[PDB]
Write a protein that binds this ligand. Structure first.
Ligand SMILES: N[C@]12C[C@H]3C[C@H](C[C@H](C3)C1)C2
Ligand SMILES: N[C@]12C[C@H]3C[C@H](C[C@H](C3)C1)C2
Length: 64
């Protein structure tokens, strides 16, 4: 499930790169790198948190 959550994070980062401004893109790219590190550490709770964070960042762009 670590890897699958990382996939969902990557999918959202792609959507942010498609519609977000460059500051939001940098925020999402840092989130992705953090998520890769958390996967490597097998820190499932952190990967779950970063997915919620990505969902929120994206929702806010999409709804602005
Ligand atoms: N302006 C930027 C373009 C691209 C995405 C992001 C980080 C780097 C590379 C600089 C913003
Ligand atoms: N692995 C990366 C994919 C993409 C380009 C670069 C910076 C970010 C976004 C993480 C390497």
């Amino acid at each position: 499930d670590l890897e699958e959550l990382l996939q969902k994070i990557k999918e959202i980062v792609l959507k942010v790169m498609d519609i977000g401004d460059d500051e939001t893109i940098k925020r999402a790219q840092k989130l992705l790198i953090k998520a890769e590190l958390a996967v490597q550490k097998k820190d499932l709770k952190e990967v779950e948190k970063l997915l919620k964070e990505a969902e929120k960042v994206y929702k806010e762009v999409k709804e602005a």
